[PDB]
Design a binder for this molecule. Structure first.
Ligand SMILES: N=C(N)c1cc(-c2ccccc2)c(CNC(=O)c2ccc3c(c2)CCO3)s1
Ligand SMILES: N=C(N)c1cc(-c2ccccc2)c(CNC(=O)c2ccc3c(c2)CCO3)s1
Ligand SMILES: N=C(N)c1cc(-c2ccccc2)c(CNC(=O)c2ccc3c(c2)CCO3)s1
Ligand SMILES: N=C(N)c1cc(-c2ccccc2)c(CNC(=O)c2ccc3c(c2)CCO3)s1
Ligand SMILES: N=C(N)c1cc(-c2ccccc2)c(CNC(=O)c2ccc3c(c2)CCO3)s1
Ligand SMILES: N=C(N)c1cc(-c2ccccc2)c(CNC(=O)c2ccc3c(c2)CCO3)s1
Ligand SMILES: [Cl-]
Ligand SMILES: [Cl-]
Ligand SMILES: [Mg+2]
Ligand SMILES: [Mg+2]
Lengths: 8, 228, 228, 8
C-alpha cells in the first residue's frame, strides 16, 4: 500500500 | 462547543497528554476546541491538530476498506451494507468537521505561507478522504485538486524544495493523482520531480533538517518503486 | 437501548464485522444489544462479548496508566489530574456496564457450568479493573475475590484442568492475587498448581485441544518466570 | 508486564 504523509 | 469552557492552554496541554495516551479521539476533540478559540495555531499546534485527526480518520478509513471489501465479496442480508454506511457516515462527519475548521476560519486567518500551505494541504487531504468513499464524486475531486494546487503554488514560491510540509504536500498530491484522479502519470511526474529537486537541495541543510527531509523523501521513493 | 430496534442475529453479525474491522467500541455496543435481547449467549457469542469489552477497557486501562504515571511524576496545574479523572470515569462506566449485563441477568440465566464459569470470571475481571483505579477499594477487591472464587469452585467440580476457560480463570485470579490483593504467594501457588495439573492432563487431549490449553499454559509460565 | 487471559 502506497504511503501518504500520514503513514511515515 | 463542549470545550468552550476550557482554557486554550489547558486544551493544548490535554491534547498532548491524549497523544501520549494514544487517545486520539480525545486529542482531536481538544484540538477542535483549541481551534474554535479563534487564535492562530503555532507550528507545533498545527501538527497536534493534524496528527489527531489523521489517527481518527485513519481508523475509520481502514475499517471502511475492510467492510467495503467484504461487501463486494458478498456481491460476486442488508447488514454488511448497513454497517459500511454507518462507518462511512461517521467518516464523512469527521471530514466535514475538519473542513469546517479550515473554512471557518483557519485558512483565511493564516497570514503566513507556512501556515496557509499547511491548512490548504489539510483541505486537499480531507476532500481526498471524502472522495475515497464517494459514489458528487467529481465535485469532491475538483475541490481536493484545487486545494492541493493552490498549496503547491504557494509552496513553490515561498518555501525551499526540502521543506517537510512542502514535501508532505507533494507526496499526498501525488497519491491523489494516482488513486483518486486516475492520473498515474501525473502522480509519477510529481513524485520524481519533488524527490529530485529535494535531493539537489540537501547540501544546504543542517544534520537535523536533513533528517526531516530525507524521511519524507523515503516515502516518495517507496511510491515510485511501486508505480514504476 | 439504542440497539433495541435491531434483530439479535443482525447484532451478532455486525459484532463479527466490527471485530474484523477492529472497531471494538462498535463491537461492544452490538454485543451489549445482543445480551439485552434476553436470550443466552452461545460459546462463540460469549467470546465475542468478552473480546469486545477486553479491547475497549484495555485501551482505557493503558491510557489511565500513562496518565497516572505522568500525574505521579508531577507530584515528586490541574490538567493532568482532570484528564486522568476523565479517562478513569469513562473506564469505570464501562466496567459498570459490563457488570450490569452480568448481574441483569447473564449470570442467573446461565444454566451451565461452562456458561456460568465464563460469566463469573468476567465479573472478577471487571471488578479487578475497578480495583486497579480505586482509592471502597477494599470492598471492590472482595467482590472480585468472591466472583473469582465461586468460578474456581464450579470449574474444579465440572471442568477438566485443561479447559481453556478454567485455565484463563486461574491465570487472571493469580494476577488478581499478585498485583491487587498483595498476595504474591497465593499468586505463585495458584499459577503453578494450575500449570502442573494441566500438563498432567494434556495426554487426554486432541491435537487441537492441546494447542488451546498449551497457549494459556505459556501465559502461566511467563508469569511464574517473572514472579520467582 | 505480566499476562492476563486478555493479552495472549
Ligand atoms: N506532538 C507531535 N506529534 C508533534 C509536535 C511537533 C513540533 C514540536 C515543536 C515545534 C514544532 C513542531 C511536530 C513536528 N513534526 C514532526 O516532528 C513530524 C511530523 C510528521 C512525521 C514525523 C515527524 C516523522 C514522520 O512523519 S510533531
Ligand atoms: N522550516 C522548517 N524546516 C521547520 C521549522 C519548524 C519549527 C517552527 C516553529 C517552532 C519550532 C519548529 C519545524 C518543526 N518541524 C516540523 O514541523 C516537521 C518536521 C518533520 C516532518 C514534518 C513536520 C512533517 C513530516 O516530517 S520544521
Ligand atoms: N515512468 C518513469 N518516470 C520511470 C520509468 C523507469 C524505467 C525505465 C526503464 C526501465 C525500467 C524503469 C524508471 C526507473 N525508476 C527511477 O528512475 C526512479 C527514479 C527516482 C526515484 C525512484 C525511482 C525512487 C526514488 O526516487 S522511472
Ligand atoms: N470471534 C472471536 N474472537 C472468537 C470466536 C470463537 C468461537 C468460534 C466458534 C465456536 C466457539 C468459539 C472463539 C473461541 N476462542 C478462541 O479461539 C480464543 C480465545 C482467546 C485466545 C485465543 C483463542 C488465543 C489466545 O487467546 S474466539
Ligand atoms: N470444551 C472445550 N475445550 C471447548 C468447547 C468449544 C466449543 C463450544 C461450542 C461450540 C464450538 C466450540 C470451544 C471453543 N474454543 C474456545 O472457546 C476457546 C479456545 C481457546 C481459548 C479460549 C477459548 C480462551 C483462551 O484460549 S473450547
Ligand atoms: N516460590 C516457588 N514456588 C518457586 C521457587 C523456585 C526456585 C527455587 C530455587 C532456586 C530458584 C528458584 C522456583 C523455580 N521455578 C519453577 O519451579 C517453575 C515451575 C513450574 C513452572 C514455571 C517455573 C513456569 C512454568 O511452570 S518456583
Ligand atoms: Cl449498522
Ligand atoms: Cl479533561
Ligand atoms: Mg511514462
Ligand atoms: Mg515461597
Amino acid at each position: 500500500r502506497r504511503f501518504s504523509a500520514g503513514m511515515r | 462547543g463542549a470545550m468552550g469552557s476550557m482554557e486554550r492552554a489547558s486544551l493544548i496541554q490535554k491534547a498532548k497528554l491524549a497523544e501520549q495516551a494514544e487517545r486520539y479521539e480525545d486529542m482531536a476533540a481538544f484540538m477542535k476546541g483549541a481551534v474554535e478559540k479563534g487564535e492562530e495555531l503555532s507550528c507545533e499546534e498545527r501538527n497536534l491538530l493534524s496528527v489527531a485527526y489523521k489517527n481518527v480518520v485513519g481508523g475509520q478509513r481502514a475499517a471502511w476498506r475492510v467492510l467495503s471489501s467484504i461487501e463486494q465479496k458478498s456481491n460476486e442480508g442488508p447488514e454488511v451494507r448497513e454497517y459500511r454506511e454507518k462507518v462511512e457516515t461517521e467518516l464523512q462527519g469527521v471530514c466535514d468537521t475538519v473542513l469546517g475548521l479550515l473554512d471557518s476560519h483557519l485558512i483565511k486567518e493564516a497570514g503566513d505561507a507556512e501556515s496557509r500551505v499547511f491548512y490548504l494541504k489539510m483541505k486537499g487531504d480531507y476532500y481526498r478522504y471524502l472522495a475515497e468513499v464517494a459514489t458528487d464524486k467529481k465535485r469532491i475531486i475538483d475541490s481536493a485538486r484545487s486545494a492541493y494546487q493552490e498549496a503547491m503554488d504557494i509552496s513553490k514560491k515561498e518555501m525551499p524544495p526540502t521543506n517537510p510540509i512542502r514535501l508532505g504536500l507533494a507526496l499526498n498530491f501525488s497519491v491523489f493523482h494516482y488513486e483518486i484522479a486516475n492520473s498515474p502519470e501525473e502522480a509519477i511526474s510529481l513524485a520524481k520531480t519533488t524527490f529530485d529537486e529535494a535531493m539537489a537541495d540537501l547540501h544546504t541543510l543542517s544534520e537535523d533538517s536533513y533528517k526531516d527531509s530525507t524521511l519524507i523523501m523515503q516515502l516518495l521513493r517507496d511510491n515510485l518503486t511501486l508505480w514504476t
